[PDB]
Amino acid sequence: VETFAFQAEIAQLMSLIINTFYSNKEIFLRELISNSSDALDKIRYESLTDPSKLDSGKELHINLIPNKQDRTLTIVDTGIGMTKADLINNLGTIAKSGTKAFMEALQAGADISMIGQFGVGFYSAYLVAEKVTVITKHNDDEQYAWESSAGGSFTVRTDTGEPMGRGTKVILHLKEDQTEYLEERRIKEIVKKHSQFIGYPITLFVEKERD
Ligand SMILES: Nc1ncnc2c1ncn2[C@@H]1O[C@H](COP(=O)(O)OP(=O)(O)OP(O)(O)=S)[C@@H](O)[C@H]1O
Ligand SMILES: [Mg+2]
């Protein structure tokens, strides 16, 4: 297991998200679905000139899986996935140019929904989750698990769980006061409100394709 420090301003942002009250937390799901859709675009376009990139799975889609027993909400996609370098670089150690400006915007009264436009949308997960685990598999790399409960660091380790063909699984360990995001009707209303025009199928467990 390898431990990494979040870049200083990313750590500051995560603390701000965790310790300051914001309404409109529901946009976390929009941000994660957008990341899945971006990842699905990437593998789709790559496959146009190299169809073998889909040997690890041809279906391009997103699954939403609430688990009330475990208090988790999982967002799974069959997008391009992340290499180990991708996880380390893109999910915490490299500075984002918009982080400081976003925190200044929040202090001035901006809605938390603006988080994606500032280039730090992933961290919206911490509005509702005490811990986030990201399991990911990219072609020509092994499967990895990234994990953080905030506090300034994350870990990365080779994953020996259920093999994915290709893509990313974001597992949100929800805070005790945010279990509304495990409810069927709640998930449907948020998807309808915020993710209506995503260009890949979205399926809610346990069985239902959302249109
Ligand atoms: N499901 C995923 N599959 C592959 N890569 C991902 C996934 N989720 C996040 N990432 C990576 O994490 C990076 C950071 O995600 P975000 O913080 O949402 O920022 P961003 O999506 O690059 O910027 P936007 O368009 O303003 S939300 C992405 O650019 C991807 O490289
Ligand atoms: Mg994003």
JSON list of C-alpha atoms and ligand atoms in Angstrom, two decimals:
[
{"chain": "A", "resi": 1, "resn": "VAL", "atom": "CA", "xyz": [0.00, 0.00, 0.00]},
{"chain": "A", "resi": 2, "resn": "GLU", "atom": "CA", "xyz": [1.25, 3.44, -0.98]},
{"chain": "A", "resi": 3, "resn": "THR", "atom": "CA", "xyz": [0.25, 6.65, 0.80]},
{"chain": "A", "resi": 4, "resn": "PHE", "atom": "CA", "xyz": [0.18, 10.06, -0.92]},
{"chain": "A", "resi": 5, "resn": "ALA", "atom": "CA", "xyz": [-0.40, 13.60, 0.31]},
{"chain": "A", "resi": 6, "resn": "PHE", "atom": "CA", "xyz": [-3.13, 15.58, -1.41]},
{"chain": "A", "resi": 7, "resn": "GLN", "atom": "CA", "xyz": [-1.78, 18.76, -2.99]},
{"chain": "A", "resi": 8, "resn": "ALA", "atom": "CA", "xyz": [-2.11, 21.49, -0.34]},
{"chain": "A", "resi": 9, "resn": "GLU", "atom": "CA", "xyz": [-5.12, 23.38, -1.84]},
{"chain": "A", "resi": 10, "resn": "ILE", "atom": "CA", "xyz": [-6.99, 20.16, -2.73]},
{"chain": "A", "resi": 11, "resn": "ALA", "atom": "CA", "xyz": [-6.60, 19.18, 0.97]},
{"chain": "A", "resi": 12, "resn": "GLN", "atom": "CA", "xyz": [-7.87, 22.60, 2.00]},
{"chain": "A", "resi": 13, "resn": "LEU", "atom": "CA", "xyz": [-10.87, 22.23, -0.30]},
{"chain": "A", "resi": 14, "resn": "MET", "atom": "CA", "xyz": [-11.71, 18.75, 1.05]},
{"chain": "A", "resi": 15, "resn": "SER", "atom": "CA", "xyz": [-11.60, 20.12, 4.61]},
{"chain": "A", "resi": 16, "resn": "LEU", "atom": "CA", "xyz": [-13.86, 22.99, 3.59]},
{"chain": "A", "resi": 17, "resn": "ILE", "atom": "CA", "xyz": [-16.39, 20.60, 1.95]},
{"chain": "A", "resi": 18, "resn": "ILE", "atom": "CA", "xyz": [-16.37, 18.36, 5.03]},
{"chain": "A", "resi": 19, "resn": "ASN", "atom": "CA", "xyz": [-16.51, 20.93, 7.80]},
{"chain": "A", "resi": 20, "resn": "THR", "atom": "CA", "xyz": [-18.63, 23.72, 6.35]},
{"chain": "A", "resi": 21, "resn": "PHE", "atom": "CA", "xyz": [-22.37, 23.35, 5.71]},
{"chain": "A", "resi": 22, "resn": "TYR", "atom": "CA", "xyz": [-23.53, 23.56, 2.06]},
{"chain": "A", "resi": 23, "resn": "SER", "atom": "CA", "xyz": [-26.99, 22.90, 0.79]},
{"chain": "A", "resi": 24, "resn": "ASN", "atom": "CA", "xyz": [-27.66, 21.35, -2.62]},
{"chain": "A", "resi": 25, "resn": "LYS", "atom": "CA", "xyz": [-25.34, 18.41, -1.90]},
{"chain": "A", "resi": 26, "resn": "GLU", "atom": "CA", "xyz": [-27.25, 16.28, -4.42]},
{"chain": "A", "resi": 27, "resn": "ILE", "atom": "CA", "xyz": [-25.05, 17.61, -7.24]},
{"chain": "A", "resi": 28, "resn": "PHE", "atom": "CA", "xyz": [-22.34, 15.15, -6.15]},
{"chain": "A", "resi": 29, "resn": "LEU", "atom": "CA", "xyz": [-24.17, 12.53, -8.23]},
{"chain": "A", "resi": 30, "resn": "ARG", "atom": "CA", "xyz": [-24.22, 14.75, -11.31]},
{"chain": "A", "resi": 31, "resn": "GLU", "atom": "CA", "xyz": [-20.47, 15.24, -10.97]},
{"chain": "A", "resi": 32, "resn": "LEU", "atom": "CA", "xyz": [-19.74, 11.51, -10.70]},
{"chain": "A", "resi": 33, "resn": "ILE", "atom": "CA", "xyz": [-22.06, 10.67, -13.63]},
{"chain": "A", "resi": 34, "resn": "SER", "atom": "CA", "xyz": [-20.28, 13.40, -15.69]},
{"chain": "A", "resi": 35, "resn": "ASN", "atom": "CA", "xyz": [-16.94, 11.81, -14.94]},
{"chain": "A", "resi": 36, "resn": "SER", "atom": "CA", "xyz": [-18.26, 8.43, -16.06]},
{"chain": "A", "resi": 37, "resn": "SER", "atom": "CA", "xyz": [-19.66, 9.92, -19.22]},
{"chain": "A", "resi": 38, "resn": "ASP", "atom": "CA", "xyz": [-16.31, 11.67, -19.98]},
{"chain": "A", "resi": 39, "resn": "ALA", "atom": "CA", "xyz": [-14.50, 8.34, -19.43]},
{"chain": "A", "resi": 40, "resn": "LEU", "atom": "CA", "xyz": [-16.97, 6.55, -21.72]},
{"chain": "A", "resi": 41, "resn": "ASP", "atom": "CA", "xyz": [-16.40, 9.20, -24.43]},
{"chain": "A", "resi": 42, "resn": "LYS", "atom": "CA", "xyz": [-12.64, 8.58, -24.13]},
{"chain": "A", "resi": 43, "resn": "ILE", "atom": "CA", "xyz": [-12.82, 4.80, -24.69]},
{"chain": "A", "resi": 44, "resn": "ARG", "atom": "CA", "xyz": [-15.50, 5.23, -27.37]},
{"chain": "A", "resi": 45, "resn": "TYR", "atom": "CA", "xyz": [-13.35, 7.53, -29.47]},
{"chain": "A", "resi": 46, "resn": "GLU", "atom": "CA", "xyz": [-10.22, 5.42, -28.91]},
{"chain": "A", "resi": 47, "resn": "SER", "atom": "CA", "xyz": [-12.13, 2.35, -30.09]},
{"chain": "A", "resi": 48, "resn": "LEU", "atom": "CA", "xyz": [-12.97, 3.95, -33.42]},
{"chain": "A", "resi": 49, "resn": "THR", "atom": "CA", "xyz": [-9.41, 3.42, -34.63]},
{"chain": "A", "resi": 50, "resn": "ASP", "atom": "CA", "xyz": [-8.55, 0.41, -32.45]},
{"chain": "A", "resi": 51, "resn": "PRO", "atom": "CA", "xyz": [-11.54, -1.88, -31.93]},
{"chain": "A", "resi": 52, "resn": "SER", "atom": "CA", "xyz": [-9.42, -4.23, -29.80]},
{"chain": "A", "resi": 53, "resn": "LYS", "atom": "CA", "xyz": [-9.63, -1.61, -27.05]},
{"chain": "A", "resi": 54, "resn": "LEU", "atom": "CA", "xyz": [-13.15, -3.00, -26.48]},
{"chain": "A", "resi": 55, "resn": "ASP", "atom": "CA", "xyz": [-11.99, -6.59, -25.99]},
{"chain": "A", "resi": 56, "resn": "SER", "atom": "CA", "xyz": [-12.28, -5.72, -22.30]},
{"chain": "A", "resi": 57, "resn": "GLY", "atom": "CA", "xyz": [-15.98, -5.02, -22.86]},
{"chain": "A", "resi": 58, "resn": "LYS", "atom": "CA", "xyz": [-18.06, -3.53, -25.65]},
{"chain": "A", "resi": 59, "resn": "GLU", "atom": "CA", "xyz": [-20.96, -2.19, -23.60]},
{"chain": "A", "resi": 60, "resn": "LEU", "atom": "CA", "xyz": [-20.64, 1.54, -22.71]},
{"chain": "A", "resi": 61, "resn": "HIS", "atom": "CA", "xyz": [-22.86, 2.37, -19.77]},
{"chain": "A", "resi": 62, "resn": "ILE", "atom": "CA", "xyz": [-23.26, 3.51, -16.17]},
{"chain": "A", "resi": 63, "resn": "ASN", "atom": "CA", "xyz": [-24.73, 1.59, -13.21]},
{"chain": "A", "resi": 64, "resn": "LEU", "atom": "CA", "xyz": [-25.94, 3.07, -9.96]},
{"chain": "A", "resi": 65, "resn": "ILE", "atom": "CA", "xyz": [-25.96, 0.64, -6.99]},
{"chain": "A", "resi": 66, "resn": "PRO", "atom": "CA", "xyz": [-27.29, 1.61, -3.58]},
{"chain": "A", "resi": 67, "resn": "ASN", "atom": "CA", "xyz": [-26.60, -0.84, -0.69]},
{"chain": "A", "resi": 68, "resn": "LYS", "atom": "CA", "xyz": [-28.54, 0.00, 2.46]},
{"chain": "A", "resi": 69, "resn": "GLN", "atom": "CA", "xyz": [-26.87, -2.75, 4.51]},
{"chain": "A", "resi": 70, "resn": "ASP", "atom": "CA", "xyz": [-23.38, -1.38, 3.79]},
{"chain": "A", "resi": 71, "resn": "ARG", "atom": "CA", "xyz": [-24.55, 2.25, 3.59]},
{"chain": "A", "resi": 72, "resn": "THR", "atom": "CA", "xyz": [-22.82, 2.66, 0.24]},
{"chain": "A", "resi": 73, "resn": "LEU", "atom": "CA", "xyz": [-23.73, 4.14, -3.09]},
{"chain": "A", "resi": 74, "resn": "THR", "atom": "CA", "xyz": [-21.64, 2.88, -5.99]},
{"chain": "A", "resi": 75, "resn": "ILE", "atom": "CA", "xyz": [-21.32, 4.53, -9.43]},
{"chain": "A", "resi": 76, "resn": "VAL", "atom": "CA", "xyz": [-19.85, 2.09, -11.97]},
{"chain": "A", "resi": 77, "resn": "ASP", "atom": "CA", "xyz": [-18.90, 2.78, -15.55]},
{"chain": "A", "resi": 78, "resn": "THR", "atom": "CA", "xyz": [-17.27, 0.90, -18.40]},
{"chain": "A", "resi": 79, "resn": "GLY", "atom": "CA", "xyz": [-15.22, 3.91, -19.48]},
{"chain": "A", "resi": 80, "resn": "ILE", "atom": "CA", "xyz": [-11.50, 4.15, -20.21]},
{"chain": "A", "resi": 81, "resn": "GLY", "atom": "CA", "xyz": [-10.47, 3.52, -16.58]},
{"chain": "A", "resi": 82, "resn": "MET", "atom": "CA", "xyz": [-7.32, 4.90, -14.90]},
{"chain": "A", "resi": 83, "resn": "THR", "atom": "CA", "xyz": [-3.78, 3.62, -14.82]},
{"chain": "A", "resi": 84, "resn": "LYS", "atom": "CA", "xyz": [-1.95, 3.79, -11.50]},
{"chain": "A", "resi": 85, "resn": "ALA", "atom": "CA", "xyz": [-0.26, 7.04, -12.65]},
{"chain": "A", "resi": 86, "resn": "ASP", "atom": "CA", "xyz": [-3.67, 8.46, -13.68]},
{"chain": "A", "resi": 87, "resn": "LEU", "atom": "CA", "xyz": [-5.07, 7.79, -10.16]},
{"chain": "A", "resi": 88, "resn": "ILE", "atom": "CA", "xyz": [-2.13, 9.36, -8.45]},
{"chain": "A", "resi": 89, "resn": "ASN", "atom": "CA", "xyz": [-1.88, 12.33, -10.79]},
{"chain": "A", "resi": 90, "resn": "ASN", "atom": "CA", "xyz": [-5.52, 13.11, -11.48]},
{"chain": "A", "resi": 91, "resn": "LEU", "atom": "CA", "xyz": [-7.06, 12.26, -8.11]},
{"chain": "A", "resi": 92, "resn": "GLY", "atom": "CA", "xyz": [-5.06, 14.28, -5.73]},
{"chain": "A", "resi": 93, "resn": "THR", "atom": "CA", "xyz": [-1.38, 15.03, -6.07]},
{"chain": "A", "resi": 94, "resn": "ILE", "atom": "CA", "xyz": [-1.39, 17.56, -8.90]},
{"chain": "A", "resi": 95, "resn": "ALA", "atom": "CA", "xyz": [-2.57, 21.14, -8.39]},
{"chain": "A", "resi": 96, "resn": "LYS", "atom": "CA", "xyz": [-5.76, 22.28, -10.08]},
{"chain": "A", "resi": 97, "resn": "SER", "atom": "CA", "xyz": [-5.69, 25.87, -11.27]},
{"chain": "A", "resi": 98, "resn": "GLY", "atom": "CA", "xyz": [-9.27, 26.58, -10.14]},
{"chain": "A", "resi": 99, "resn": "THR", "atom": "CA", "xyz": [-9.08, 25.29, -6.54]},
{"chain": "A", "resi": 100, "resn": "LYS", "atom": "CA", "xyz": [-8.25, 28.57, -4.77]},
{"chain": "A", "resi": 101, "resn": "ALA", "atom": "CA", "xyz": [-10.76, 30.55, -6.86]},
{"chain": "A", "resi": 102, "resn": "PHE", "atom": "CA", "xyz": [-13.47, 27.99, -6.06]},
{"chain": "A", "resi": 103, "resn": "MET", "atom": "CA", "xyz": [-12.88, 28.30, -2.33]},
{"chain": "A", "resi": 104, "resn": "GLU", "atom": "CA", "xyz": [-13.01, 32.09, -2.60]},
{"chain": "A", "resi": 105, "resn": "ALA", "atom": "CA", "xyz": [-16.27, 31.74, -4.58]},
{"chain": "A", "resi": 106, "resn": "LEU", "atom": "CA", "xyz": [-17.79, 29.56, -1.85]},
{"chain": "A", "resi": 107, "resn": "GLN", "atom": "CA", "xyz": [-16.79, 32.01, 0.86]},
{"chain": "A", "resi": 108, "resn": "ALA", "atom": "CA", "xyz": [-18.53, 34.74, -1.21]},
{"chain": "A", "resi": 109, "resn": "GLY", "atom": "CA", "xyz": [-21.74, 32.70, -1.39]},
{"chain": "A", "resi": 110, "resn": "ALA", "atom": "CA", "xyz": [-21.50, 30.58, -4.52]},
{"chain": "A", "resi": 111, "resn": "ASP", "atom": "CA", "xyz": [-23.55, 27.44, -4.76]},
{"chain": "A", "resi": 112, "resn": "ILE", "atom": "CA", "xyz": [-21.60, 24.18, -4.27]},
{"chain": "A", "resi": 113, "resn": "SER", "atom": "CA", "xyz": [-23.02, 23.17, -7.69]},
{"chain": "A", "resi": 114, "resn": "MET", "atom": "CA", "xyz": [-20.35, 25.39, -9.33]},
{"chain": "A", "resi": 115, "resn": "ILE", "atom": "CA", "xyz": [-17.68, 22.90, -8.25]},
{"chain": "A", "resi": 116, "resn": "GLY", "atom": "CA", "xyz": [-17.40, 21.17, -11.64]},
{"chain": "A", "resi": 117, "resn": "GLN", "atom": "CA", "xyz": [-16.84, 24.40, -13.54]},
{"chain": "A", "resi": 118, "resn": "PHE", "atom": "CA", "xyz": [-13.75, 25.04, -11.39]},
{"chain": "A", "resi": 119, "resn": "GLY", "atom": "CA", "xyz": [-12.14, 21.71, -12.34]},
{"chain": "A", "resi": 120, "resn": "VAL", "atom": "CA", "xyz": [-12.50, 19.96, -8.95]},
{"chain": "A", "resi": 121, "resn": "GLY", "atom": "CA", "xyz": [-15.88, 18.22, -9.31]},
{"chain": "A", "resi": 122, "resn": "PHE", "atom": "CA", "xyz": [-14.76, 14.81, -7.99]},
{"chain": "A", "resi": 123, "resn": "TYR", "atom": "CA", "xyz": [-14.37, 16.20, -4.46]},
{"chain": "A", "resi": 124, "resn": "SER", "atom": "CA", "xyz": [-18.13, 16.80, -4.30]},
{"chain": "A", "resi": 125, "resn": "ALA", "atom": "CA", "xyz": [-18.23, 13.14, -3.19]},
{"chain": "A", "resi": 126, "resn": "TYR", "atom": "CA", "xyz": [-17.12, 14.39, 0.23]},
{"chain": "A", "resi": 127, "resn": "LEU", "atom": "CA", "xyz": [-20.34, 16.37, 0.64]},
{"chain": "A", "resi": 128, "resn": "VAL", "atom": "CA", "xyz": [-22.10, 13.05, 1.32]},
{"chain": "A", "resi": 129, "resn": "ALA", "atom": "CA", "xyz": [-19.37, 10.45, 1.88]},
{"chain": "A", "resi": 130, "resn": "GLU", "atom": "CA", "xyz": [-17.11, 9.89, 4.89]},
{"chain": "A", "resi": 131, "resn": "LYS", "atom": "CA", "xyz": [-14.87, 7.65, 2.78]},
{"chain": "A", "resi": 132, "resn": "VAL", "atom": "CA", "xyz": [-14.49, 7.17, -0.95]},
{"chain": "A", "resi": 133, "resn": "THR", "atom": "CA", "xyz": [-12.99, 4.14, -2.65]},
{"chain": "A", "resi": 134, "resn": "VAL", "atom": "CA", "xyz": [-12.27, 4.20, -6.41]},
{"chain": "A", "resi": 135, "resn": "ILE", "atom": "CA", "xyz": [-11.62, 0.78, -8.05]},
{"chain": "A", "resi": 136, "resn": "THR", "atom": "CA", "xyz": [-10.39, 1.19, -11.63]},
{"chain": "A", "resi": 137, "resn": "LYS", "atom": "CA", "xyz": [-9.07, -0.88, -14.55]},
{"chain": "A", "resi": 138, "resn": "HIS", "atom": "CA", "xyz": [-7.43, 0.59, -17.68]},
{"chain": "A", "resi": 139, "resn": "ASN", "atom": "CA", "xyz": [-6.33, -1.49, -20.69]},
{"chain": "A", "resi": 140, "resn": "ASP", "atom": "CA", "xyz": [-2.64, -2.50, -20.49]},
{"chain": "A", "resi": 141, "resn": "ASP", "atom": "CA", "xyz": [-2.56, -1.90, -16.65]},
{"chain": "A", "resi": 142, "resn": "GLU", "atom": "CA", "xyz": [-3.67, -3.89, -13.57]},
{"chain": "A", "resi": 143, "resn": "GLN", "atom": "CA", "xyz": [-6.71, -3.12, -11.40]},
{"chain": "A", "resi": 144, "resn": "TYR", "atom": "CA", "xyz": [-6.17, -0.54, -8.68]},
{"chain": "A", "resi": 145, "resn": "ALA", "atom": "CA", "xyz": [-7.90, 0.78, -5.58]},
{"chain": "A", "resi": 146, "resn": "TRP", "atom": "CA", "xyz": [-7.64, 4.43, -4.52]},
{"chain": "A", "resi": 147, "resn": "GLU", "atom": "CA", "xyz": [-9.09, 5.33, -1.11]},
{"chain": "A", "resi": 148, "resn": "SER", "atom": "CA", "xyz": [-9.40, 8.34, 1.13]},
{"chain": "A", "resi": 149, "resn": "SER", "atom": "CA", "xyz": [-11.26, 9.44, 4.26]},
{"chain": "A", "resi": 150, "resn": "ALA", "atom": "CA", "xyz": [-9.77, 12.90, 3.74]},
{"chain": "A", "resi": 151, "resn": "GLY", "atom": "CA", "xyz": [-7.46, 14.33, 6.45]},
{"chain": "A", "resi": 152, "resn": "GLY", "atom": "CA", "xyz": [-4.85, 15.16, 3.85]},
{"chain": "A", "resi": 153, "resn": "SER", "atom": "CA", "xyz": [-3.86, 11.78, 2.39]},
{"chain": "A", "resi": 154, "resn": "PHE", "atom": "CA", "xyz": [-5.04, 8.95, 0.18]},
{"chain": "A", "resi": 155, "resn": "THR", "atom": "CA", "xyz": [-3.83, 5.45, -0.59]},
{"chain": "A", "resi": 156, "resn": "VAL", "atom": "CA", "xyz": [-3.31, 3.44, -3.74]},
{"chain": "A", "resi": 157, "resn": "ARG", "atom": "CA", "xyz": [-2.91, -0.33, -3.91]},
{"chain": "A", "resi": 158, "resn": "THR", "atom": "CA", "xyz": [-3.24, -3.08, -6.45]},
{"chain": "A", "resi": 159, "resn": "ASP", "atom": "CA", "xyz": [-6.79, -4.44, -6.14]},
{"chain": "A", "resi": 160, "resn": "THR", "atom": "CA", "xyz": [-7.50, -8.13, -5.56]},
{"chain": "A", "resi": 161, "resn": "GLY", "atom": "CA", "xyz": [-11.29, -7.89, -5.48]},
{"chain": "A", "resi": 162, "resn": "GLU", "atom": "CA", "xyz": [-13.79, -8.79, -8.18]},
{"chain": "A", "resi": 163, "resn": "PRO", "atom": "CA", "xyz": [-12.01, -8.21, -11.52]},
{"chain": "A", "resi": 164, "resn": "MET", "atom": "CA", "xyz": [-13.58, -5.53, -13.73]},
{"chain": "A", "resi": 165, "resn": "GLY", "atom": "CA", "xyz": [-13.05, -5.80, -17.45]},
{"chain": "A", "resi": 166, "resn": "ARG", "atom": "CA", "xyz": [-12.44, -2.08, -17.81]},
{"chain": "A", "resi": 167, "resn": "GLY", "atom": "CA", "xyz": [-13.80, 1.06, -16.23]},
{"chain": "A", "resi": 168, "resn": "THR", "atom": "CA", "xyz": [-14.21, 2.65, -12.81]},
{"chain": "A", "resi": 169, "resn": "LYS", "atom": "CA", "xyz": [-16.24, 2.00, -9.71]},
{"chain": "A", "resi": 170, "resn": "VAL", "atom": "CA", "xyz": [-16.69, 4.87, -7.22]},
{"chain": "A", "resi": 171, "resn": "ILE", "atom": "CA", "xyz": [-17.86, 3.58, -3.85]},
{"chain": "A", "resi": 172, "resn": "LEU", "atom": "CA", "xyz": [-19.30, 6.19, -1.57]},
{"chain": "A", "resi": 173, "resn": "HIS", "atom": "CA", "xyz": [-19.41, 5.24, 2.11]},
{"chain": "A", "resi": 174, "resn": "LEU", "atom": "CA", "xyz": [-22.20, 7.65, 3.05]},
{"chain": "A", "resi": 175, "resn": "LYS", "atom": "CA", "xyz": [-22.31, 9.78, 6.19]},
{"chain": "A", "resi": 176, "resn": "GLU", "atom": "CA", "xyz": [-25.04, 8.71, 8.61]},
{"chain": "A", "resi": 177, "resn": "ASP", "atom": "CA", "xyz": [-27.07, 11.87, 7.86]},
{"chain": "A", "resi": 178, "resn": "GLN", "atom": "CA", "xyz": [-26.94, 11.40, 4.08]},
{"chain": "A", "resi": 179, "resn": "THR", "atom": "CA", "xyz": [-28.63, 8.02, 3.63]},
{"chain": "A", "resi": 180, "resn": "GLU", "atom": "CA", "xyz": [-31.39, 9.59, 1.52]},
{"chain": "A", "resi": 181, "resn": "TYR", "atom": "CA", "xyz": [-29.04, 8.85, -1.45]},
{"chain": "A", "resi": 182, "resn": "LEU", "atom": "CA", "xyz": [-29.70, 5.13, -0.98]},
{"chain": "A", "resi": 183, "resn": "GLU", "atom": "CA", "xyz": [-33.40, 5.59, -1.80]},
{"chain": "A", "resi": 184, "resn": "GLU", "atom": "CA", "xyz": [-34.71, 4.62, -5.22]},
{"chain": "A", "resi": 185, "resn": "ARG", "atom": "CA", "xyz": [-36.98, 7.62, -5.57]},
{"chain": "A", "resi": 186, "resn": "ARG", "atom": "CA", "xyz": [-34.28, 10.07, -4.48]},
{"chain": "A", "resi": 187, "resn": "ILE", "atom": "CA", "xyz": [-31.71, 8.70, -6.95]},
{"chain": "A", "resi": 188, "resn": "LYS", "atom": "CA", "xyz": [-34.32, 8.88, -9.75]},
{"chain": "A", "resi": 189, "resn": "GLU", "atom": "CA", "xyz": [-35.22, 12.50, -9.04]},
{"chain": "A", "resi": 190, "resn": "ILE", "atom": "CA", "xyz": [-31.58, 13.61, -8.96]},
{"chain": "A", "resi": 191, "resn": "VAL", "atom": "CA", "xyz": [-30.74, 11.82, -12.20]},
{"chain": "A", "resi": 192, "resn": "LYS", "atom": "CA", "xyz": [-33.84, 13.29, -13.88]},
{"chain": "A", "resi": 193, "resn": "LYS", "atom": "CA", "xyz": [-33.02, 16.80, -12.61]},
{"chain": "A", "resi": 194, "resn": "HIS", "atom": "CA", "xyz": [-29.29, 16.93, -13.27]},
{"chain": "A", "resi": 195, "resn": "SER", "atom": "CA", "xyz": [-28.18, 14.14, -15.65]},
{"chain": "A", "resi": 196, "resn": "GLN", "atom": "CA", "xyz": [-31.08, 14.01, -18.12]},
{"chain": "A", "resi": 197, "resn": "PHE", "atom": "CA", "xyz": [-28.93, 14.46, -21.23]},
{"chain": "A", "resi": 198, "resn": "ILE", "atom": "CA", "xyz": [-26.07, 12.05, -20.54]},
{"chain": "A", "resi": 199, "resn": "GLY", "atom": "CA", "xyz": [-25.49, 10.11, -23.76]},
{"chain": "A", "resi": 200, "resn": "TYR", "atom": "CA", "xyz": [-24.98, 6.65, -22.28]},
{"chain": "A", "resi": 201, "resn": "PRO", "atom": "CA", "xyz": [-27.44, 4.31, -20.65]},
{"chain": "A", "resi": 202, "resn": "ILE", "atom": "CA", "xyz": [-27.84, 4.67, -16.86]},
{"chain": "A", "resi": 203, "resn": "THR", "atom": "CA", "xyz": [-29.17, 1.70, -14.85]},
{"chain": "A", "resi": 204, "resn": "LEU", "atom": "CA", "xyz": [-30.37, 1.71, -11.25]},
{"chain": "A", "resi": 205, "resn": "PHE", "atom": "CA", "xyz": [-30.07, -1.42, -9.16]},
{"chain": "A", "resi": 206, "resn": "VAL", "atom": "CA", "xyz": [-31.69, -3.58, -8.82]},
{"chain": "A", "resi": 207, "resn": "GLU", "atom": "CA", "xyz": [-32.74, -3.82, -12.52]},
{"chain": "A", "resi": 208, "resn": "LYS", "atom": "CA", "xyz": [-34.11, -0.61, -13.97]},
{"chain": "A", "resi": 209, "resn": "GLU", "atom": "CA", "xyz": [-32.81, 1.34, -16.96]},
{"chain": "A", "resi": 210, "resn": "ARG", "atom": "CA", "xyz": [-33.57, 5.09, -16.45]},
{"chain": "A", "resi": 211, "resn": "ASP", "atom": "CA", "xyz": [-35.09, 7.12, -19.28]},
{"chain": "B", "resi": 1, "resn": "LIG", "atom": "N1", "xyz": [-15.06, 7.54, -13.66]},
{"chain": "B", "resi": 1, "resn": "LIG", "atom": "C1", "xyz": [-13.85, 7.97, -14.06]},
{"chain": "B", "resi": 1, "resn": "LIG", "atom": "N2", "xyz": [-13.17, 7.33, -15.04]},
{"chain": "B", "resi": 1, "resn": "LIG", "atom": "C2", "xyz": [-11.95, 7.76, -15.44]},
{"chain": "B", "resi": 1, "resn": "LIG", "atom": "N3", "xyz": [-11.36, 8.84, -14.91]},
{"chain": "B", "resi": 1, "resn": "LIG", "atom": "C3", "xyz": [-11.95, 9.53, -13.89]},
{"chain": "B", "resi": 1, "resn": "LIG", "atom": "C4", "xyz": [-13.23, 9.11, -13.40]},
{"chain": "B", "resi": 1, "resn": "LIG", "atom": "N4", "xyz": [-13.61, 9.99, -12.41]},
{"chain": "B", "resi": 1, "resn": "LIG", "atom": "C5", "xyz": [-12.60, 10.90, -12.29]},
{"chain": "B", "resi": 1, "resn": "LIG", "atom": "N5", "xyz": [-11.62, 10.59, -13.19]},
{"chain": "B", "resi": 1, "resn": "LIG", "atom": "C6", "xyz": [-10.38, 11.33, -13.37]},
{"chain": "B", "resi": 1, "resn": "LIG", "atom": "O1", "xyz": [-10.36, 12.34, -12.38]},
{"chain": "B", "resi": 1, "resn": "LIG", "atom": "C7", "xyz": [-10.11, 13.63, -12.96]},
{"chain": "B", "resi": 1, "resn": "LIG", "atom": "C8", "xyz": [-10.72, 14.71, -12.08]},
{"chain": "B", "resi": 1, "resn": "LIG", "atom": "O2", "xyz": [-12.15, 14.66, -12.08]},
{"chain": "B", "resi": 1, "resn": "LIG", "atom": "P1", "xyz": [-12.94, 16.03, -11.71]},
{"chain": "B", "resi": 1, "resn": "LIG", "atom": "O3", "xyz": [-12.45, 16.46, -10.37]},
{"chain": "B", "resi": 1, "resn": "LIG", "atom": "O4", "xyz": [-14.41, 15.75, -11.90]},
{"chain": "B", "resi": 1, "resn": "LIG", "atom": "O5", "xyz": [-12.42, 17.09, -12.79]},
{"chain": "B", "resi": 1, "resn": "LIG", "atom": "P2", "xyz": [-12.74, 17.13, -14.33]},
{"chain": "B", "resi": 1, "resn": "LIG", "atom": "O6", "xyz": [-13.88, 16.22, -14.64]},
{"chain": "B", "resi": 1, "resn": "LIG", "atom": "O7", "xyz": [-11.43, 16.81, -15.04]},
{"chain": "B", "resi": 1, "resn": "LIG", "atom": "O8", "xyz": [-13.10, 18.65, -14.63]},
{"chain": "B", "resi": 1, "resn": "LIG", "atom": "P3", "xyz": [-14.65, 19.11, -14.93]},
{"chain": "B", "resi": 1, "resn": "LIG", "atom": "O9", "xyz": [-15.00, 18.83, -16.39]},
{"chain": "B", "resi": 1, "resn": "LIG", "atom": "O10", "xyz": [-14.64, 20.60, -14.65]},
{"chain": "B", "resi": 1, "resn": "LIG", "atom": "S1", "xyz": [-15.90, 18.14, -13.54]},
{"chain": "B", "resi": 1, "resn": "LIG", "atom": "C9", "xyz": [-10.74, 13.53, -14.33]},
{"chain": "B", "resi": 1, "resn": "LIG", "atom": "O11", "xyz": [-10.28, 14.50, -15.28]},
{"chain": "B", "resi": 1, "resn": "LIG", "atom": "C10", "xyz": [-10.36, 12.10, -14.69]},
{"chain": "B", "resi": 1, "resn": "LIG", "atom": "O12", "xyz": [-9.01, 12.12, -15.18]},
{"chain": "B", "resi": 2, "resn": "MG", "atom": "MG", "xyz": [-15.61, 15.90, -13.56]}
]
